[PDB]
Write a protein that binds this ligand. Structure first.
Ligand SMILES: NC(=O)c1cnc(C(F)(F)F)nc1
Ligand SMILES: [Zn+2]
Ligand SMILES: [Zn+2]
Ligand SMILES: [Zn+2]
Length: 585
């Protein structure tokens, strides 16, 4: 028994064809089965024919006769159909309201999550459907990992390098950081975990969560997890106040956090507030600063990734009493300078999926662009706070949507919080980039920030751009542009100072060929997000939607403190780079 995700109407029915089995009310259960292919219906039992070896599961073809369910064939003389009168049969028949359109819920219930339009719906539908979609999508995402073949150690060629044999008649996952495996040694009568792993083409290069002497017959699967049902909305109902509420501002603040005193005040006069922090504009400085501005306030610092939480801890370590901090870790190596799993400590740093059930004066959810509505709901479910602050940049990179291949996902669809920042705009904006040369600040300001991002640093005159398509080759799940690397090889012979540069591209295979040929450290744009380097060499590699995504490109070029070379494929983004043009060697 439970609550009809469309009416809320109290019902005894769940759709059995829906992978989440949402409770549906007589009206809504009915309007769902007749308009889709979903016809299995679960109650306190499954509406299936209890006749001996009868296949009939379709609720339209079934009847209650006695207190058992039957098809046309096996039914007793006295029966009524389970599914007529615009209603399916269960408890609470008399309480039931329905809807004018069940269209959105049917599409969420039945979409395969490969098209952008699916994520657009999950973000514009009603809030209760946002939760149902967020569950349905995540469960689809975890199930699709099982579709992938087991990889098995056939040969140990060296250290860091392996020969994999692959389960037959199942697809192989792409071999980039987005796919994290789990090893396993072959035991008496079962299997035991042996760390999480990632892989890259060679054989295969593996970078594992621990070190081992892993031997032949050890095998790797993408560990999937149970997706829980969602209760809390993605955003709580907004409230605006006329005084700061529940928080006591400091009398003396340092001139280091003085630029955020206005903003910290806004944080205190609404229930939840959005901070768009462009690259190197001071998000974590803002987040720790809030503690100093509201010294007595209990603050839970949260984010999706261990790395985002650890970065909030590193900043905290520099400004807040250590004895007042605790890192929550569930029973991967993360920040170990705070007492571990002390829920009652004044400053709690902890990832979304490890959050305890607790209250707080402020919740700071950092790197908000990487959040899904699933994560938004979890936070609201685990943490009851006087104030919620969502820090991020909807111009940076979202969580990867492993399933999505048709359409592009616009930032107003990354999650509820981002949707607000792109539609009404953010409550607050860090408007001065400290990290990057003026030429890169001026470019992204125009590109994705509506000419509101200001350069702290001057021009470096060390920002170059070259229009060179070269030659694209494809391997199994990536791209390579050898001529674009060749051009960098030549630039480096003529500009050897640039040998301190990080190499960035939108493809891990481009990156692998580059590491061999240039010996620069390499990053994918997606793995570079939240890191800074003096000198960046970027090869676009392709002109695909992937390699021209304005958010990817925004993150690529804003990694540079001093200088950047961009070897560009796309004439559009080339022309938007406010950089010195260099001609083809
Ligand atoms: N000044 C130029 O037109 C120019 C040509 N070529 C190069 C290369 F290939 F070394 F990167 N850098 C600059
Ligand atoms: Zn269904
Ligand atoms: Zn209903
Ligand atoms: Zn039957």
């Amino acid at each position: 028994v439970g609550a009809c995700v469309l009416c809320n109407s109290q019902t005894s029915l769940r759709c059995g064809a829906c992978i989440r089995r949402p409770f549906l009310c007589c009206k809504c259960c009915y309007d769902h089965v007749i308009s889709t292919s979903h016809k299995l219906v679960l109650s306190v039992n499954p509406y299936v024919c209890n006749a001996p070896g009868c296949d009939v599961t379709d609720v339209t073809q079934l009847y209650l006769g006695g207190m058992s369910y039957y098809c046309k064939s096996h039914k007793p003389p006295i029966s009524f159909p389970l599914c007529a009168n615009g209603q399916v049969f269960g408890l609470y028949k008399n309480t039931c309201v329905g809807s004018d359109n069940v269209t959105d819920f049917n599409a969420i219930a039945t979409c395969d999550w490969t098209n952008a339009g699916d994520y657009i719906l999950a973000n514009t539908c009603t809030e209760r459907l946002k939760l149902f979609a967020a569950e349905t999508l995540k469960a689809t995402e975890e199930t699709f990992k099982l579709s992938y073949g087991i990889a098995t150690v056939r040969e140990v060629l060296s250290d860091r390098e392996l020969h994999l044999s692959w389960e037959v008649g199942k697809p192989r996952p792409p071999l980039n950081r987005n796919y994290v495996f789990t090893g396993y040694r072959v035991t008496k009568n079962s299997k035991v975990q042996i760390g999480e792993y990632t892989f890259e083409k060679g054989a295969v290069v593996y970078r594992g969560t621990t070190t081992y002497k892993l031997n032949v017959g050890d095998y790797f699967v993408l560990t999937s997890h149970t997706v829980m049902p969602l209760s809390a909305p993605t955003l709580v109902p907004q409230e605006h106040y006329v005084r700061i509420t529940g928080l006591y501002p400091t009398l003396n603040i340092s001139d280091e956090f003085s630029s955020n005193v206005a903003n910290y005040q806004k944080v205190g006069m609404q229930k939840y507030s959005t901070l768009q922090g462009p690259p190197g504009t001071g998000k974590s400085h803002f987040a720790i600063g809030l503690a100093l501005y509201y010294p007595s306030a209990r603050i839970v610092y949260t984010a999706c990734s261990h790395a985002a939480v650890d970065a909030l801890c590193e900043k905290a370590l520099k400004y807040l009493p250590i004895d007042k901090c605790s890192r929550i870790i569930p029973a991967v190596e993360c920040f170990d300078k705070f007492k571990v799993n002390s829920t009652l400590e004044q400053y709690v740093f902890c990832t979304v999926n490890a959050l305890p059930e607790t209250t707080a004066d402020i919740v700071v959810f950092d790197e908000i662009s990487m959040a899904t509505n699933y994560d938004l709901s979890v936070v609201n479910a685990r943490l009851r706070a006087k104030h919620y602050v969502y820090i991020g940049d909807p111009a940076q990179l979202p969580a990867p949507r492993t399933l999505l291949t048709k359409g592009t996902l616009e930032p107003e669809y990354f999650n509820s919080v981002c949707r607000l920042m792109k539609t009404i705009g953010p409550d607050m904006f860090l408007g001065t980039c400290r990290r990057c040369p003026a030429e890169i600040v001026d470019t992204v300001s125009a590109l994705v920030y509506d000419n509101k991002l200001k350069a702290h640093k001057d021009k470096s005159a060390q920002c170059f751009k070259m229009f060179y398509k070269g030659v694209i080759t494809h391997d199994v799940s990536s791209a390579i542009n050898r001529p674009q690397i060749g051009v960098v090889r030549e630039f480096l012979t003529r500009n050897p100072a640039w040998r301190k540069a990080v190499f960035i591209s939108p493809y891990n295979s481009q990156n692998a060929v580059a590491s061999k040929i240039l010996g620069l450290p390499t990053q994918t744009v997606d793995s570079s997000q939240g890191s800074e380097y003096d000198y960046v060499i970027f090869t676009q590699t392709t002109e695909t939607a992937h390699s021209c995504n304005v958010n990817r490109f925004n993150v690529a070029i804003t990694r540079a403190k001093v200088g950047i070379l961009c070897i560009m494929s796309d004439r559009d983004l080339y022309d938007k780079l406010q950089f010195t043009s260099l001609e083809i060697p």
